[PDB]
Amino acid sequence: AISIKTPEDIEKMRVAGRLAAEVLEMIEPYVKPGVSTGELDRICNDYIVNEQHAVSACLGYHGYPKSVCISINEVVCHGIPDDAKLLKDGDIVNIDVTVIKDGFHGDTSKMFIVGKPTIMGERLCRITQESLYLALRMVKPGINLREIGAAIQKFVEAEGFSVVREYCGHGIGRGFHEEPQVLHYDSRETNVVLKPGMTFTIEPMVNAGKKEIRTMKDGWTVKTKDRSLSAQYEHTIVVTDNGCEILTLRKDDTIPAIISHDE
Ligand SMILES: N=C1N=NC(N)=C1/N=N/c1cccc(C(=O)O)c1
Ligand SMILES: [Co+2]
Ligand SMILES: [Co+2]
Ligand code: NA
């Protein structure tokens, strides 16, 4: 039961996706040693509401208390912005932005490396982004999502890293999470043949160590069981007649927005 967006809906998703990307471009100069994640979230929320005239989709969702998710180092996902949590040299930090504009969602995330990188953090982030990019290059009508998940997993595991099983990409539109699920690993349960006009995210979570995760007592924060680093990147796309179009591209992305597989 996957919805096919009309041309007009796709345009609304271009607008919302651009906004989500622009939050990430806006926040970059503030992501520096010494800043708190609480401050970063306030800057993002003020921007979303006062400048973009949009709404955070995370705020209040299942009771989530903040406007963007900010996850550092061994935190896998859903980290909660906190005025007492300060960024420091060598940290890897995901900021995940999901906004609603004119009824439609845009959803994206990226890693930031704070100050002087660690080589392992830089490698983990790079491989994670590359795994997203290889998946994006596969998207076209007639391909199965299973093939995409399997390919992400093979690539990541060859680097000695692992793919988190509990979270996945998703259909997106008027709802935050819509059909289909987009698993970043191979499953016999996956059988989804892509069609033009489907809109969904790809967003692998990749651990440097083992795949297993743990949720903290705060009921939100997810960490690697082994306290290894974890990284994630996310884009929202639309399937096109000949490939896909990335709706959340930033200037710092190094893949084209429009990917075509025709001659
Ligand atoms: N921020 C997101 N981007 N893609 C997703 N699937 C994201 N999920 N975010 C949240 C945010 C708050 C709560 C939850 C939840 O599952 O309870 C999930
Ligand atoms: Co997201
Ligand atoms: Co998402
Ligand atoms: Na992390």
UniProtKB/Swiss-Prot annotation:
Residue positions binding substrate: 78, 98, 177
UniProt KW Hydrolase keyword: yes
InterPro entries on file: Creatinase/aminopeptidase-like (IPR036005), Pept_M24 (IPR000994), Pept_M24_MAP (IPR001714), Pept_M24A_MAP1 (IPR002467)
Protein's UniProt name: Methionine aminopeptidase
Record note on cofactor: Binds 2 divalent metal cations per subunit. Has a high-affinity and a low affinity metal-binding site. The true nature of the physiological cofactor is under debate. The enzyme is active with cobalt, zinc, manganese or divalent iron ions. Most likely, methionine aminopeptidases function as mononuclear Fe(2+)-metalloproteases under physiological conditions, and the catalytically relevant metal-binding site has been assigned to the histidine-containing high-affinity site.
Assembly with partners or alone: Monomer.
Gene source species: Escherichia coli (strain K12)
UniProt family annotation: Belongs to the peptidase M24A family. Methionine aminopeptidase type 1 subfamily.
GO molecular function, one term: metalloaminopeptidase activity
Organismal lineage: Bacteria, Pseudomonadati, Pseudomonadota, Gammaproteobacteria, Enterobacterales
